[PDB]
């Protein structure tokens, strides 16, 4: 976990560049109105544009940790979903798929700055994983 | 809702490229291109972490469009030591071998490198073997920023030192025969230093 290269803020912006415009009227020199020349309803944004902010690199790291580690944590750390029927047989796909794991168990900040396998995962078979490339290839040889 | 949905727009790939250039190149630009922050106290000593961390660099100095379409190192970076960087993978690994915290009890095995003895076959006898070890944190440690660790609070205590040696469990008649051959002057061992240079 060498953390994330998030020094620069990352923003999304409105489709037109700007959205919270003021309606304004052209004036001339003491000051008086204009018309037949310039329109009397111009749309001008005063200040910076409307923006929202997302940490891209932290999100990508979070998603990688959740998909490849949190979801594979031993079942004793998971819990059964609320208001959802789940199989009674832990050997089933339905059980493995519906058991819920909290993302904060392997979050962005897990053993930050360390090279460290989780004690919870040391004794879990690492080959039983969607990133087993030999098994993915053998699955793909048959088709999709 | 009448019409299309409300949406905002972000260039993902341009942002990821921008972040990579800022983190790994802009922040490592020579200090003469940086400036000191406004309304923030900063160290007066450029060798410190606080100075290196708080000096500000403009992202437009190495932006998305820097020498676009080229394979080109920045002239500003050619003479900056490239190994002093958080993407030095050997140094990252060595840092991670100790752990992720500032406080580390350590336990290491240190090899003998002097060419006249590092491959010597030493015959029966009792020998004095003594060596001298450094304590200066700027020599015994390495940082990726290269800050002066003497002023920046690192320290180290060497608590114990043992000498280990491993012996092939040689048949005793063979060992004594070998020893006798190796004590004759025609069978003196010899070694050349690898670098083989006088260094100025």
């Amino acid at each position: 976990n060498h953390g994330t290269e998030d020094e620069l803020p990352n923003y999304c912006f409105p489709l037109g560049g700007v959205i919270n415009t003021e309606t304004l009227t052209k004036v001339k020199p003491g000051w008086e109105k204009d018309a037949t020349e310039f329109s009397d309803k111009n749309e001008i944004r005063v200040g910076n544009n409307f923006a929202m902010e997302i940490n891209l690199n932290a999100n990508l790291w979070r998603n990688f940790l959740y998909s490849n580690i949190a979801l594979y944590l031993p079942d004793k750390l998971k819990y059964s979903p609320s208001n959802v029927k789940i199989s009674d047989n832990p050997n089933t796909y339905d059980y493995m798929n519906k058991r819920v794991v909290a993302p904060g168990l392997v979050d962005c900040y897990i053993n930050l700055g360390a090279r460290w396998s989780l004690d919870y995962m040391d004794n879990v078979n690492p080959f039983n994983h969607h990133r087993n490339a030999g098994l993915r290839y053998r699955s793909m040889l048959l088709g999709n | 809702r009448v019409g299309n949905n409300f949406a905002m727009e972000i260039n993902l790939n341009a942002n990821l490229w921008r972040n990579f250039l800022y983190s790994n190149i802009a922040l490592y630009l020579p200090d003469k291109l940086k400036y000191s922050p406004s309304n923030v106290k900063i160290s007066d000593n450029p060798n410190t972490y606080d100075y290196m961390n708080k000096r500000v660099v403009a992202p437009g100095l190495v932006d998305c469009y820097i020498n676009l379409g080229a394979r080109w190192s920045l002239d500003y970076m050619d003479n900056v030591n490239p190994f002093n960087h958080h993407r030095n993978a050997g140094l990252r690994y060595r840092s991670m071998l100790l752990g992720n915290g500032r406080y580390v009890p350590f336990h290491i095995q240190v090899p003998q490198k002097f060419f006249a003895i590092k491959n010597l076959l030493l015959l029966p006898g009792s020998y004095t073997y003594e060596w001298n070890f450094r304590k200066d944190v700027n020599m015994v440690l390495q940082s990726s920023l290269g800050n002066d660790l003497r002023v920046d609070g690192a320290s180290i205590k060497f608590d114990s030192i043992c000498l280990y040696a491993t012996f092939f469990p040689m048949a005793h008649n063979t060992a004594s025969t070998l020893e006798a051959m190796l004590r004759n002057d025609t069978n003196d061992q010899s070694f050349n230093d690898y670098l083989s240079a006088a260094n100025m």
Binding site: - | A58, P59, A70, G125, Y127, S144, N199
Partner: protein, 245 residues
């Protein structure tokens, strides 16, 4: 940080321009009209000398041939990539990195304006000004950089350079620069057997705005012979030659 002298993280080899080697005040080495510039080793040449450059950078033909021969014995029967097991981490060709770029020609591009970082705008409205801080400003056509492609590409100039990190530059004392035994042919020559000689070397380097050091390794035999004549006795004879201590 890293300490190149001890660890081999060399990264300033491209700052060398040339070296002239002279024995006894006036005997140029190698002399013998061997090199295209025969009195010195020219490492790189600027624009004015580009005819003698090679490999699409500003390194000279002569220097490339001496480096290839010193490292791999390649240069008299064609240039090719060395076998990977001969081209190690700190070897010449593994580290050789020629590069080129164009840039606006500030004398021929009639419309040239020297616009500095304080006044460049590109992504105004969407990035912070001079800092990695909050977006600010307004959307506007960019004023920078100059386009070097398309139908309105600006007049441009080309720059060429190289990096060659990790390795040391090498000039072997061997009559064809090739490795033909550790104890070289010139090292055994009568000329160096019987007399003494003084040596001058003059290096030209690119200027750097801090103190630096020329590190010269004078390559010799650095040898020890070890005698163990009796239980718990170890004796050693050292010989470094030349440059005996």
């Amino acid at each position: 940080g890293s300490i190149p002298y001890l660890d081999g993280t060399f990264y300033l080899n491209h700052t060398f321009k040339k070296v002239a080697i002279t024995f006894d005040s006036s005997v140029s080495w190698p002399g013998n009209d061997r090199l295209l510039t025969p009195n010195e080793f020219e490492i790189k040449r600027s624009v004015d000398g580009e005819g003698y450059n090679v490999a699409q950078c500003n390194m000279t033909k002569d220097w490339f041939l001496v480096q290839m021969l010193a490292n791999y014995n390649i240069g008299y029967q064609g240039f090719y990539i060395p076998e990977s097991y001969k081209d190690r981490m700190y070897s010449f060709f593994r580290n050789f990195q020629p590069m080129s770029r164009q840039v606006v020609d500030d004398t021929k591009y009639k419309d040239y304006q020297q616009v500095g970082i304080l006044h460049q705008h590109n992504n105004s409205g969407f990035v912070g000004y001079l800092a990695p801080t909050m977006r600010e400003g307004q959307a506007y056509p960019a004023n920078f950089p100059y386009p070097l492609i398309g139908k309105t590409a600006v007049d441009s100039i080309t720059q060429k350079k190289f990096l060659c990190d990790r390795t040391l530059w090498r000039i072997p004392f061997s009559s064809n620069f090739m490795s033909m035994g550790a104890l070289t042919d010139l090292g055994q020559n009568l000329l160096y057997a019987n007399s003494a000689h003084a040596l001058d070397m003059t290096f030209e380097v690119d200027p750097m705005d801090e103190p630096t050091l020329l590190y010269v390794l004078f390559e010799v035999f650095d040898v020890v012979r070890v005698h163990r004549p009796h239980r718990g006795v170890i004796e050693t004879v050292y010989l470094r030659t030349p440059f005996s201590a």
